[PDB]
Design a protein around this ligand. Structure first.
Ligand SMILES: *[C@](=O)([C]([C][C][C][C])[N]C(=O)O[C]C1([C]C2=[C][C]=C(F)[C]=[C]2)[C][C][C]1)C(=O)[N]C1=[C][C]=N[N]1
Ligand SMILES: *[C@](=O)([C]([C][C][C][C])[N]C(=O)O[C]C1([C]C2=[C][C]=C(F)[C]=[C]2)[C][C][C]1)C(=O)[N]C1=[C][C]=N[N]1
Lengths: 215, 215
């Protein structure tokens, strides 16, 4: 694996979205990972539908949270997921309005990164592409993040509560990091992104519940 | 009165929730106590709405924290609280959207446990049911709790920063404890729970800010 990787430069990452007043971070994380594999397999980058996931993944809790793996499973068993244009994001749970006509991607399943292994996560990102990850984003320090490589001793890897997307990794000012795409809008963090400490004892639990879809 | 009590066995406790990033621990603590009394009064166990409290208890600070007593006061004055289904949790403060038709419980008052009295808290849990309590959960040792009876001399009884639910009490390997339900997801601690030292000089301030609603 390369010392650094940034899928944003390769056109594998769509613009930063804003999930609004809906606990759908898991759906944005999921579509982000799907968009990466779609681009890698078809060569086209397009926005997939997080609303499709919020409304149709029965095992998850819609605007109340959910597992990225359940989303991948849904896409697989559903034989597809709609594009954002065909199933627009509205910010609240609605009745399932999925339709094969707007299908823009499929899923053959998913894999979970060995729990707590950042080196494994690194390998996955390098070989597969953007990977869905879960972290503790409950600290005010995370909420008001502006720049630099984020590390807070108070982060709790035993309290995973937010789903985001690892689109790469590298180092800045001698500090290794993960390039994380959030879904709180472009005005949050650094243009919607946050560099999170890498190889710093699994800070914020970045490698505790990571996964990627098979396409 | 009994040596041991566990309301989870009696079906007075709903599944462990994940509060996300919103500082709503007080709301989950409040609904937990309300859920217990509702089961007792109607025989039914159901999720009540923490979002309803976050958005409508103007006396509190929404995602910035709040008092469980102010929550009970609101339910009383408001003539009710919604079920989770009728007012779903989204992990961010919204405009107050209380639905009167979705009312699932009422509150005719509440009482505050005499400050620092663990004996009184014990009697309350035994007689009333689950009780809302506040503790010092700022220690790394608390964050990474996994098993046994939690005790850390560095805990500060007068640093009440986290709201949880006491669903019982007992003794493990000779160590008296309180059975505490957190709102950091089922993967935190021991299936979302933590046993905290009981009768150990009011450890972590367990009996300094405890209260329960009446139905
Ligand atoms: C976001 O962080 C969601 C919010 C959940 C609470 C509204 N969290 C989330 O989905 O995390 C997913 C898990 C933990 C989990 C699993 C199942 C659940 F039902 C709930 C939580 C981490 C790995 C799985 C989020 O959307 N944040 C947000 C809310 C409002 N704006 N941003
Ligand atoms: C939680 O511990 C909240 C967070 C408040 C700060 C964001 N604390 C809390 O509400 O505690 C309630 C008190 C103390 C208090 C009173 C009034 C306030 F305005 C603030 C605090 C204890 C008894 C009353 C919490 O939600 N933690 C959490 C946030 C994200 N994940 N977990």
């Amino acid at each position: 694996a390369p010392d650094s990787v940034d899928y944003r430069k390769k056109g594998y990452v769509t613009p930063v979205k804003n999930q609004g007043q809906c606990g759908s971070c898991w759906a944005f994380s999921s579509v982000g990972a799907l968009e990466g594999q779609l681009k890698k397999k078809t060569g086209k980058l397009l926005n997939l539908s997080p609303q499709n996931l919020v409304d149709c993944v029965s095992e998850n809790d819609g605007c109340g949270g959910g597992y990225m793996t359940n989303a991948f499973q849904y896409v697989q068993k559903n034989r597809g997921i709609d594009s954002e244009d065909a199933y627009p994001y509205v910010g609240q749970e609605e009745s399932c309005m999925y339709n094969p006509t707007g299908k823009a991607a499929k899923c053959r399943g998913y894999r979970e990164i060995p729990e707590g292994n950042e080196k494994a996560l690194k390998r996955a990102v390098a070989r597969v592409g953007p990977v869905s990850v879960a972290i503790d984003a409950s600290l005010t320090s995370f909420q008001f993040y502006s720049k630099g490589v984020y590390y807070d001793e108070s982060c709790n890897s035993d309290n995973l509560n937010h789903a985001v997307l690892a689109v790469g990794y590298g180092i800045q000012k001698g500090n290794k990091h993960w390039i994380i795409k959030n879904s709180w809008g472009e005005n949050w963090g650094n243009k919607g992104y946050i560099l999170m400490a890498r190889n710093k004892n699994n800070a914020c639990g970045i490698a505790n519940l990571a996964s990627f879809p098979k396409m």
